[PDB]
Amino acid sequence: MLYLVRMTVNLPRNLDSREEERLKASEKARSRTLQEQGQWRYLWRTTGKYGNISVFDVNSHDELHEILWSLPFFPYLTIDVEPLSHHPARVGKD
């Protein structure tokens, strides 16, 4: 079932560099896995910002939680979660 998840990314202004390589790499794989499995249904970029707007499809809140906590970006993320329900006036799937 569906959640609207806004993420905003706050990489430490100075430092890491360039462990920034290891972290950005686990993040892109981790997000590819999650998208391949349908967990991470949709992924877009907020135009002009370092952050995404996503729709997750998971079985429960606890699942959504562990998935987000697992993200390599987590300690650097600001996350808003928002439960999505079916709309009567919908037509196809989703």
Q: Which residues bind a copy of itself (CB under 8 A)?
A: 1-5, 12-15, 24, 27-28, 31-32, 35-36, 41-49, 52-53, 55, 60-62, 64-65, 68-69, 75, 79-92, 94
Question: Distance (Å, rounded) from C-alpha 91 to C-alpha 33?
Answer: 29
In this complex, which beta carbon is closest to a copy of itself, that of residue 22 or of residue 65? Answer: 65
Interatomic CA distance for residues 13 and 63, integer angstroms: 31
C-alpha angle with apex 53: 76 to 92, nearest 5 degrees?
Answer: 150
| Closest separation in Å from C-beta 18 to a copy of itself | 14
